[PDB]
């Protein structure tokens, strides 16, 4: 499936974003009213 190829394709970048969010901060966190 094209979708599974994509996931594996962008797994490396998803990690870098995860690390980045932790470091910097999460926008959703500062902002969910429930």
């Amino acid at each position: 499936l094209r979708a599974e190829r994509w996931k594996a394709e962008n797994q490396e970048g998803m990690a870098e974003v995860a690390r980045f969010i932790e470091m910097n901060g999460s926008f959703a966190d500062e902002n969910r009213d429930w």
Partner: protein, 101 residues
């Protein structure tokens, strides 16, 4: 996991939500979800197109699409239901909030 309904482990007016994020989109420790509220809490003046009504056991819930958010795994409880069959209506509620829809 997409279209699954979980318990909200936090003290708030919401008790349930539904995961609406793609299963191909891996955000470690986070999922984008839509919160549910009892259908009688909102009048019929509320768009069923924007805020769909779903059923989970002995209760009807409105899907607060506009009040969606990403939540930490930490407040994500156990699966209580699966609304994958309402994929069309969920997809329509969301595509409409962002686009004309």
């Amino acid at each position: 996991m997409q279209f699954k309904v979980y318990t909200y482990k936090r003290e708030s007016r919401y008790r349930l939500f539904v995961d609406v994020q793609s299963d191909i989109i891996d955000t470690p420790g986070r999922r984008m979800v839509i919160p549910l509220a009892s259908a009688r809490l909102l009048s019929d003046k509320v768009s069923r197109e924007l805020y769909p009504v779903v059923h989970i056991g002995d209760e009807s819930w409105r899907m607060m699409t506009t009040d969606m958010a990403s939540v930490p795994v930490s407040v994500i409880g156990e699966e209580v239901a699966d609304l994958s069959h309402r994929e069309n209506d969920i997809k329509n509620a969301i595509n409409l909030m962002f686009w004309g829809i």
